[PDB]
């Protein structure tokens, strides 16, 4: 609950089975380019290689997975401290947002607010988000090393069914926030109790009658058929 | 199916509070090569830390549910081979009684 940032993080293994320089880059929300994993860890605070490698590979013995990380280390060799890592992230906009102080300040915000927003969106939680990214790289390499199977996109355990409650929740949130910004409009007008209760009622009313689950008489894409007339042919029906 | 129900969605904190108290080392202090066989513990795709004897923890958590102390609609799985313990307080999961 809370805004619901639908930011999907992709951790990409560049190069194919039989191509040299198989690097690992990751597409970060609000950043145009895919940043080599290393720089992300550095921007997080995990600065030396091996401290970075410890977060990804958990067995010091497993040479196979470790050789697979050498290219990444080479890719992130340019950036050596936390600051230069954030600048590199900040350079790649956004738009770009020209100014040195501006770009380094950005990358801070993206890693805090848009990168791995579950876990925490709080400040001092680099350690948590680093180990997670490392758990992700571990899984990426585990599948590429043919030790694990590709994820079944059709496993029912990985699916959820939104019933009446979560459905209403989504729609009520949309409208209450529309009321909040109408409350702000009448407060701005009051340069010195006019809160339209119609928006909440008529909103829910629209959705549940049409079955067009969204705001409102200006719906598309909205998902039609969410609400429908109950079959009363037979009891079983 | 007749006996299918769908998880309403509970609070994760009583379980996160419970875990730490039952031998769960927090991720903030993890040192992979020190505890290398450590079972990684997740609560709603959020890695909270690790645990050294999951065997006993898993039994405690199961007894917690089967008593009612941990809600019965909460899902907890222990993949021994993968060294993982994932917990779901999560809404929308379809369940059946056995």
């Amino acid at each position: 609950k809370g805004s619901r940032f639908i930011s999907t993080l992709q951790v990409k293994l560049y190069g194919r089975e039989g191509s040299s320089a198989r690097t690992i880059k990751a597409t970060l929300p609000y950043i145009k380019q895919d940043i080599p994993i290393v720089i992300i860890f550095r921007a997080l605070g995990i600065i030396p290689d091996g401290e970075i490698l410890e977060h990804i590979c958990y067995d010091v013995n497993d040479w196979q997975m470790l050789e697979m990380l050498k290219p990444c280390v080479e890719d992130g060799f340019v950036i050596q401290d936390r600051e230069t890592a954030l600048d590199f992230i900040g350079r790649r906009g956004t738009a770009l947002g020209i100014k040195k102080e501006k770009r380094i300040q950005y990358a801070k915000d993206i890693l805090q607010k848009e990168f791995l927003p579950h876990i925490t969106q709080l400040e001092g939680f680099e350690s948590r988000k680093a180990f997670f990214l490392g758990y992700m790289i571990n899984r990426l390499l585990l599948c590429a090393l043919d030790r694990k199977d590709q994820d079944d996109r059709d496993h029912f355990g990985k699916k959820r069914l939104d019933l009446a409650g979560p459905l209403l929740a989504q729609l009520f949130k949309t409208l209450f926030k529309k009321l909040t910004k109408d409350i702000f409009r009448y407060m701005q007008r009051t340069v010195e109790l006019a809160i339209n209760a119609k928006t909440i009622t008529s909103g829910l009313k629209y959705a549940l009658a049409t079955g067009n689950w969204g705001e409102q008489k200006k719906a598309m894409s909205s998902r039609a058929g969410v609400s429908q007339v109950l079959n009363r042919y037979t009891y079983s029906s | 199916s007749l006996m299918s129900c769908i998880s309403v969605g509970t609070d994760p904190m009583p379980i996160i509070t419970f875990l730490s108290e039952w031998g769960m080392e927090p991720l903030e202090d993890y040192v992979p090569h020190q505890s290398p066989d450590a079972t990684r513990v997740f609560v709603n795709g959020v890695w909270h830390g690790v645990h050294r004897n999951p065997a006993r923890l898993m039994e405690t958590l199961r007894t917690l549910r089967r008593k009612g102390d941990i809600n019965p609609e909460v899902s907890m799985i222990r993949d021994i081979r993968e060294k993982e313990l994932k917990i779901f307080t999560d809404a929308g999961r379809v369940y059946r009684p056995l």
Binding site: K1, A164, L168, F172, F176, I183 | -
Partner: peptide, 30 residues
């Protein structure tokens, strides 16, 4: 599902990003 929404969820939605320079307290449903 609906029961969980009214009793809980609905109250939480009412007070999350709500407060304006004006806050929203406990909710009541007739």
């Amino acid at each position: 599902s609906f029961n969980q929404f009214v009793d809980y969820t609905l109250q939480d939605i009412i007070c999350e990003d709500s407060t304006l320079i004006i806050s929203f307290g406990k909710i009541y449903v007739t």
